[PDB]
């Protein structure tokens, strides 16, 4: 259903709201009308390493099979998790980079429009001059 | 979890407007439209579209759908019937873009 606060939104309370704002600026339904407050190089050098280790574990997992394999698969799990950590470090950085790209594109577009109209105007002027050079 | 807060209650309620069937259930009523209370509440919930209240909105649709309904309550069954078909056309594309 709908929240209970809706029962405090009558036209009379809306008529009493401005003076309650001016009075409170200097507990009730009019407080229900007031909105609530707001609550209170890099990793690329390691990724390679991790990658190189992953294969090295896979070989082990191949070379075991016996009941020893279990122990090995544990280590493998840890490696994969590490990979995920570094990618987490790539989540916000790439976002900012994307913003950069967008802005640059905007700049280029801006100049392109003007350039188009410019060349058109030039052509027009030349054409008229030609006609002039044929009469006198 | 402990007792809720009016901020989270109004936040989850305005965020519930992103669902189409829920808005359909809210509009296909007969009691909440006899008195000018639910309309003034929806028009009151327009503070989430402005910062810093917009920093907690997870679904961008619920806000704009709210502005549509607040845009429609100013000026019965038929139009209420009219909106969901169109929004239905819109949904799946965004769903494809999400995941």
């Amino acid at each position: 259903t709908s929240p209970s606060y809706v029962k405090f939104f009558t036209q009379s309370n809306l008529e009493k709201l401005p003076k309650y704002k001016e009075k409170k600026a200097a507990t009730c339904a009019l407080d229900y009308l007031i909105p609530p407050p707001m609550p209170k190089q890099y990793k690329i050098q390691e990724l390679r390493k991790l990658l190189k280790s992953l294969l090295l574990n896979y070989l082990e997992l191949i070379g075991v099979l016996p009941d020893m394999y279990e122990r090995k698969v544990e280590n493998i799990r840890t490696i994969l998790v590490n990979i995920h950590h570094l990618l987490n470090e790539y989540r916000p950085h790439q976002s900012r980079e994307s913003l950069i790209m967008l802005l640059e594109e905007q700049l280029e577009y801006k100049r392109g429009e003007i350039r188009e109209i410019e060349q058109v105007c030039k052509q027009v002027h030349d054409k008229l001059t030609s006609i002039q050079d044929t009469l006198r | 979890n402990p007792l809720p807060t009016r901020f989270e209650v109004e936040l989850e309620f305005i965020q519930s407007l992103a669902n189409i069937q829920y808005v359909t259930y809210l509009l296909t009523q007969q009691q909440i439209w006899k008195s000018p209370n639910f309309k003034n509440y929806l028009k009151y919930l327009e503070y989430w579209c402005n910062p810093p209240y917009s920093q907690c909105i997870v679904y961008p649709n619920c806000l704009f759908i709210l502005k549509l309904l607040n845009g429609f309550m100013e000026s019965x069954x038929x139009x209420x019937x009219x909106x969901x078909x169109x929004x239905x056309x819109x949904x799946x594309x965004x769903x494809x873009x999400x995941x």
Binding site: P3, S4 | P4, E12, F13, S16, Y22
Partner: peptide
Amino acid sequence: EDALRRGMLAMASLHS
């Protein structure tokens, strides 16, 4: 419709 009944909309619209 599950996040409303499992969240806070059910209880907030029920305690009154």
